A paper describes a structure:
Zhx1 to 3 (zinc-fingers and homeoboxes) form a set of paralogous genes encoding multi-domain proteins.
The structure determination of crystals grown using protein derived from OPPF_2273 (ZHX2 HD2-3) revealed a number of unexpected features. Firstly, it became clear during the refinement that the two ZHX2 homeodomains present within the asymmetric unit were of identical amino acid sequence and were not covalently linked, unexpected for protein derived from the bidomain HD2-HD3 construct. The switching of the positions of the two helices I in ZHX2 HD2 provides an example of 'domain swapping'. Thus, this homeodomain conformation appears to be unique amongst reported crystal/NMR structures for this domain class. In contrast, for ZHX2 HD2 the rearranged conformation involving movement of helix I, relative to the canonical homeodomain fold, would disrupt the normal DNA binding site, however, protein-protein interact is possible as a homodimer is observed.
Author numbering:
A (entry chain A), B (entry chain B): 446 to 501
The structure:
Amino acid sequence: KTKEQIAHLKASFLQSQFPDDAEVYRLIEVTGLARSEIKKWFSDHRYRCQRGIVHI
Amino acid sequence: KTKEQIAHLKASFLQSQFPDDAEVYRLIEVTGLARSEIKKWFSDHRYRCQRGIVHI
């Protein structure tokens, strides 16, 4: 697989790890968590997800 | 943090790791990879992601 097509797969795979603020709002109203609470969670899970992908 | 809250965050985070076949269509026409080749890549990267999240 070329670097290009791998770039497209990651882009697509990672979309929902960077929620837009409509999605963050949606999360606030279903979770009751603070915006920054939600943000910290996502950032942390991205870090762990990527460390999973890189190690394997 | 409750199990309910974590469920909403997880459901959101994992969204784009299960591309619907409009998304996969978009990937075919942007990567030239087969439907099955795209599915195997995602599944593999779902596994690596979750192991990262589970073990870190």
